[PDB]
Design a protein around this ligand. Structure first.
Ligand SMILES: Nc1ncnc2c1ncn2[C@@H]1O[C@H](COP(=O)(O)OP(=O)(O)O)[C@@H](O)[C@H]1O
Ligand SMILES: Nc1ncnc2c1ncn2[C@@H]1O[C@H](COP(=O)(O)OP(=O)(O)O)[C@@H](O)[C@H]1O
Ligand SMILES: Nc1ncnc2c1ncn2[C@@H]1O[C@H](COP(=O)(O)OS(=O)(=O)O)[C@@H](O)[C@H]1O
Lengths: 203, 200
């Protein structure tokens, strides 16, 4: 019987794909969730790989149902999400996250956790920071849930882009100017990048 | 010309060619949980060709749960988080394999309902050895430290272990080859049709 756990190399070959994390960041209504859902469809369906999205829906009322909006809780929220994305990446799955993650330190913390060697290997796992970029005016014109309106009326306290800052990434792996660009083209810009790094199986 | 709705379990199941579920190991320190987890993961990924992942002390205690100490509020939290992570894995159509002592019936029960509450299968595996067997293995000298009071509230010595009354799989993991134990688990999984067809 095997006494040593599967190595990244054995798992990579046996699962026939690599593991990495795709981290979307951008204003509310920039389209993070929209790109994540379609990106996941193509990866699993079109590319035949294991990919899984982490977002408010499966995190907020589960793993992080105990976190509020305090500085401490906001940091812990990001920390936990990052550790989880890392576990999926370590299992040779492609984790896709779509949290506003407004602060540079939010993404730095997630990147660092991924970029540090894993128990056994000499390297970490790829962390692909995708800036889903739209001017605030574009986000406000979308405002599907009315959040911006309620943000400009204090109904919502400190809202990214309105009463709290969004710190734009200077050097994201993928910068998607997600406006006046069809969703299919934006998702393609992402998949095309992944292919240039050979992060995906043939096709 | 794009998907507005996220992949459904049914579709992810078709596309991934496997079901997702959580195999929860529970038992005393040195009962053999990691050994079983490692070999089980090898067999599921290699021989059965599926996506499975072990959640053990290694990748959890120093990462996601590094902030957790030992107050009971902490041991409950440790278990709760692990259960939620296992569920996400099952939801992704992966077979999560967790190996934590998880001494309290309450925690395992809470973990289970998190899954069964349509829903994900939760296969509770009791990796059972009487305490004298675990204490004679004591590969890391933890039992010796517990006996000397160097480690307090040590499961099975100075803290309780609530054995599962009706676990899906009961492994009498003593004077038993690891291969036979893993086979017991995998065979149970096939009786439930949880795995794709065996490779020819
Ligand atoms: N490339 C795009 N072109 C036009 N509309 C888009 C595009 N991407 C996203 N949207 C639209 O913008 C709104 C916000 O998208 P959403 O995914 O909910 O954003 P976020 O997850 O960043 O809050 C939705 O109405 C969505 O359909
Ligand atoms: N079936 C077995 N028979 C005899 N020894 C075993 C068996 N399974 C595991 N062990 C031994 O027992 C020790 C504890 O196993 P381990 O898997 O680390 O336990 P646990 O993870 O439950 O604390 C190890 O030294 C291992 O080699
Ligand atoms: N007080 C303690 N009780 C039990 N295990 C302990 C204790 N202190 C340290 N350990 C170590 O931590 C492992 C148990 O950790 P877990 O499996 O994560 O336990 S659980 O109860 O929270 O599920 C044991 O194998 C042992 O190496």
């Amino acid at each position: 019987f095997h006494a040593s756990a599967l190595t990244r190399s054995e798992r990579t070959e046996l699962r026939n794909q690599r593991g990495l994390t795709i981290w979307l960041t951008g204003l509310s209504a920039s389209g993070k969730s929209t790109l994540a859902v379609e990106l996941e469809h193509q990866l699993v369906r079109d590319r035949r790989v294991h990919a899984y999205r982490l977002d408010g829906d499966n995190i907020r009322f589960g793993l992080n149902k105990d976190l509020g909006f305090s500085e401490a809780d906001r940091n812990e929220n990001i920390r936990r999400i990052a550790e989880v994305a890392k576990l999926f990446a370590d299992s040779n799955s492609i984790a896709i996250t779509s949290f506003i993650s407004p602060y540079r330190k939010d993404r730095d913390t997630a990147r660092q956790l991924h970029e540090v060697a894993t128990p056994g290997e000499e390297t970490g796992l790829p962390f692909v920071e995708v800036y889903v970029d739209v001017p605030v005016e574009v986000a406000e014109q979308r405002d599907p849930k009315g959040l911006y309106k309620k943000a400009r009326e204090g109904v919502i306290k400190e809202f990214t882009g309105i009463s709290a800052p969004y710190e734009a990434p200077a050097n994201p792996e993928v910068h998607v100017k997600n406006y006046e660009l069809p969703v299919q083209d934006a998702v393609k810009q992402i998949i095309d990048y992944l292919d240039t790094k050979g992060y995906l199986p043939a096709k």
